[PDB]
């Protein structure tokens, strides 16, 4: 029986796979049992036969037992590493019950074997546990069966570390049994090197650690993160025995205690900055922390602490002075000793929350920014809060404490802006009159027995949230209504609050109300159900004394000559008609209706302002404008014309629906007396239903696009017998009262000011009627009427906007809201005036001497229009009006085109212009009816567009997704045009287009329409797109009725294309046509479409509807779909466009690309087919517009287009490797303060954005959506040319100023690193920004980038006039001065100034005398006067020198006082004092490496040089006095009668040749001293008397050369010597008025130009001047010779107010400072970034190279 198995094994050993297959299948046929089948399955797994495994499991259905035995195929496959077999076997198991037992077995066995791939697949895909035991039933666990232990024991490092990193954890067994490789892995892979190796061993669950594991790297850092484990003790060395630790994370473990140090001298780690010992069992902090003078953060949170420290109240604790943050929350602290909190001085945040604290610690002076003391048992608060923390403490929370009252100081905090006192036993507040907390943004007083509550007035302009819910509040505190800036109020959970006072309606920005458990008597329950917004609106209505307005607007509509005026007459009078009605196009009147008996209406009667609109058919198109939403419409028709009349009604009905979607429409039949009575029941009931059939769906619902007419809205009436007049007016009243906005419209509450404005406007209309004026009310005049209104509550415009809405709804005002160029600034007062003026201008029957083919000269038109105003003062308005209605359009500036004056078809040469060519495309529009004036408007608009395009070839554009459209796709020079009333032929180079009304008769549907034909010899068919956009826009604007179907679904307009194949076959007949819908829908997918007459000869779409295929574009722009790896997966979505498109992450030709794709379909059915076709047409049009726009953009900062494709409809753009600027900026801004991306890089980003905006605006392209989201970052490397590009996708009136505003916003987000967080609701943000609120960025002192801050603040100025243009911004950023000056700091009156090496006293000033002598210390990095006029009595000083820890101070009493830095501020007691033969003028310190000492050379007022040896900052008394005169008489032998022996003061001192020598000044000459022998060795003569060397400077070059620069005080010239050869190499006259690109050779207002000092800044030399202009110079190599040149000229003009430069100095490796003095001896410090050759070079390279693209 078993022999079969052996055979199969033989079949595999011999390689006979086929024999194995057959034998195995036969054995399976015999082996029915599950056990036998599993035994068989073990065989191909043993071989590793993936194929036979698949056959066996797929066909024979062999089960895989989960038993982890030797016979298990999965165990065998894992044993031999056949990973594919492993996954196949595991996949075969059904259900979700993954065999974690078997998986763990395979894991452990593979780990023993080393088949790492099986392990990787087991854990990462199947989740085998790395920490379990692989132990069979009736088997005992051991450690060798644990995965990680065996992995390490096997010696395979890769598998072991993989397990450790992906779930496996250490244990005592690993650490004890195999310590060596364990320590190896720990010391090897978890090292973040930087020595400073930040070793992270957390989350490994180390039971213990040992110094032996990392003491070998205790030189700087052993390890930092030791958290997430069960440590119960630490080595004695951590942290104290480890010198350069900075931040330890010892939290999250069993460290109930810590080791310590016996004394501070044992703390080798004096520079630790952060300690986290949280989530531990600490009862007390170790005392050792109190010795860390450098510690910055300490978070001993989430502990069982009972005391902050042990009671060592005798030790002079020195540490924790600079501790800025202390988190001791989640503890059992009852007392916080005032001792150590007082000891802390830099403390900014005390998180003592969640403790047993009953007495808040005593207050002390320290810069607290927050105090989270919540969840304690505090009884009272400190009373010095407004004394110590007056201007520092911002966030405060003493909520849920044992408080009964608070001191005034709490509410006198000026910096306080978040206060949370909820959950306490507060009964009353301090009086508001003594409050000075003007920055309160949130104040929660909930859960308190307090109820009178009163607030300060200023709180109305600062508060944003207030929460008074759940208090002793039976009445709303009246002061609450005063908080206009409030946004969120909680008044709920107040059962005794039985009213909501009306004054709360004044709360302008309030939108959220907690109305829980409140009964509001004064508000209807319906309003309460509607919600808080309804409540506030109703309360505001109550406040403004709103009246019930019973006036409504109704319009009578219908075909002409149907007795509209008759119907109105019987409705008004209720009698037989009497009036003979005239020719007026419009009549206006008034009518009141009493409520019929039995009425349930809310009013006694209703009032109606009535417009009866009629007139000649020519004005019908314009009359449709008078229709408005929220009005009654009565459509009247003659019953006698029956079906015929009913048909026409659909037209009218659509017109009402297109303009008044919420209109109540009645349909009434007249001439009831003309129908035989006996048949009326049959005749009416039919016709009634018949008209319903013309407006109702087959299901009975409303036909889409039609008004909601129902059975109850129909009525019949007579005029002679007046049958049903009572019924008709009853119906009118019932629907009127039934109509609703929300409440019913009739009698709705209207604010009193609105009604007063209505009466004022009516009075103005009547005045103009009496004065024969023109019914044109401008915004100014409407505002004036508003101002003259008594009881006027309109303060902001939005109130007037709501008022205007009310007036237009009521029928007082007529408005046409077009915002183009201030066109909206008009309102109309009388329909009669408007209609009469329009009719008069229409009726200009100008002869051929007047209208020159439709255009009348401007002066002639002005004269012709005299009769209805048309004075010059109002002229513009009329044209602004007339252009809107398209009655007269500007033509150049020469004439005006009047569309109704187009000539008939002239007998011109249409044949010659026509091209009998094969590049023919034809389209045909079929129209059920032709709207009146359609053709004139269409032809006029298209002619205007052609003229505009002709002008453009020598301005309303857009960018990104928008509803703004422009036919940029048609850029064609126009050669010649023939145009007439019903068509036009327009010819251009290479072809033409033609439109003409045609007798369209497809399928015997003889109706209106047009034929359009396009020819272009180059296959450029943008003309057809032009025609289609004009058609779509015109129909949408002026004739919306045509974008609709009949009630049965028959479309009113269709568009066909004639088949070219059928025409060719014929070339009469109804040539077989394709419906445009199926054309476009098939063009989505296919390339060929089958004609019904030629089912076996499909025709290409490309020669049928080429506009869809972009056949006009260049060939190179097309993509190849086979080369496009497109992915529609959810993870491949890069973003979303503004048009519903999607930006996918794809690859083209292997390069990553962003494909913008259009998704057209939105789920046989004709209606769905039409909807899909329309959507496809829209998406194609937007595709074409976007493609044409993007194709014309070529700039280094605009996302370029790669190519396009049709199947699917999508195109490709270059992809951003680093995503958006928002991404990188957000992730870098978290851990910094300002300029997160760096100085140079941030300047680069700003310049790139400015260049992109300038380029876009130059092309008349407007962005409108400039955000960090749309900016795409490619490289943060400053050396690359391009770093960012502006994209058209993210991840009302617009102009360049809006883009510049958004640019200022982007600049703010760049500098701050935070978004302009004015809120999370956009409406509130917009309201704040419009009203002058802006987000806060720090002062220049902390930004350090002044000039761009100036630009950024200038960008969002409330007035667009002051907002700069993009070009000027680019020009500003061109100059290096834009991004070299950082800021300025004004120090006021002073007496002396001293620089430093940058170690301590970065800058210091001195003032006063004797008792008043004081000093000011300025730190440039923070821009703060860290010491402010600290007293230091004594005699004033001429020079100083600070080195090591000692400051030498040369007083004018010929004495040098040596102080130590260890005295901190009061350096009044000198450590040494040394006499001098004369007052020292200057100092120099030169170290000696061979001696570990320093030499302080003191340059005297006589020219002699004193040598003070110094050892570790300790001066020695063994001075020497090198005599200049001795050196002269000995060597230089200058005659005594020379001026050179005048005892010149020593001005200049510098080290030369790496401190080998010292060079100093002596009159015109220089003297060089040996540093080894101290003998004066050399003299040099750069200048001649009366000159003198004011300074000497030496620095290293990029070539390794060392050279010395020296400046003359008088000649104002700079000379350059070489250090070792001692020859003058260069002479440069510096007093150049305009030193632009000055160049001078180098050998191998008159006071403004005076140089003051020479500064060595990196590899460049900075020469500042009195005039504030500083020149930076370097040198370059040309053909071996050298040449010194100006690299840049800098001058911060904003330093002019601070007078003249008194001096300058280099104060840091990257910073330069200068001091400007005014006439009052008040100084200002102006600081420039310390750029070297590299920084200037890269800045210039960036600007120039971008300029060269
Ligand atoms: N017999 C009869 N004639 C009517 C009825 N309604 C209107 N008319 C006629 O309609 C004419 C007035 O139409 P008209 O006011 O010019 O309509 P308009 O073009 O909208 O102004 C009158 O001469 C009436 O004879 C009706 O119910 N019965």
Author numbering: 51 to 244, 254 to 510, 539 to 828, 835 to 1047, 1061 to 1173, 1182 to 1277, 1285 to 1412, 1439 to 1791, ...
Per the authors:
Leucine Rich Repeat Kinase 1 and 2 (LRRK1 and LRRK2) are homologs in the ROCO family of proteins in humans. LRRK1 and LRRK2 have a similar domain organization: an N-terminal half containing Ankyrin (ANK) and Leucine Rich Repeats (LRR), and a catalytic C-terminal half containing the ROC–COR ROCO signature, followed by the kinase and a WD40 domain. Despite their shared domain architecture and involvement in intracellular trafficking, their disease associations are strikingly different: LRRK2 is involved in familial Parkinson’s disease while LRRK1 is linked to bone diseases. LRRK1 and LRRK2 use different mechanisms of autoinhibition, with LRRK1 having a second level of autoinhibition absent in LRRK2.
Our initial model for the kinase domain of LRRK1 showed density in the back pocket of the kinase that was not accounted for by the model. The density was located where Y1410 from the DYG motif would dock in the DYG ‘in’, or active, conformation. Symmetry expansion and focused refinement of the dimer dataset showed that a loop from the COR-B domain (residues 1,048–1,082), which is predicted by AlphaFold to be entirely disordered, threads into the kinase domain active site. The side chain of F1065, at the tip of the loop, sits inside the back pocket of the kinase, occupying the position of Y1410 in the DYG-in conformation. A similar ‘plugging’ of the kinase back pocket was observed in the DDR1 kinase. This suggests that the COR-B loop is an autoinhibitory element in LRRK1. We tested this by measuring Rab7a phosphorylation in 293T cells expressing either WT LRRK1 or LRRK1(F1065A), which we expected would at least partially relieve the autoinhibition. In agreement with this, the F1065A mutation led to a two-fold increase in the level of Rab7a phosphorylation in cells, comparable to that observed with the hyperactive K746G mutant. Our structure provides a mechanistic explanation for this activation: phosphorylation of these residues disrupts the loop, which is nestled against the kinase domain, releasing F1065 from the kinase’s back pocket and allowing the DYG motif to adopt the active ‘in’ conformation. The autoinhibitory COR-B loop is unique to LRRK1 and provides an additional level of regulation, present in both our monomer and dimer structures.
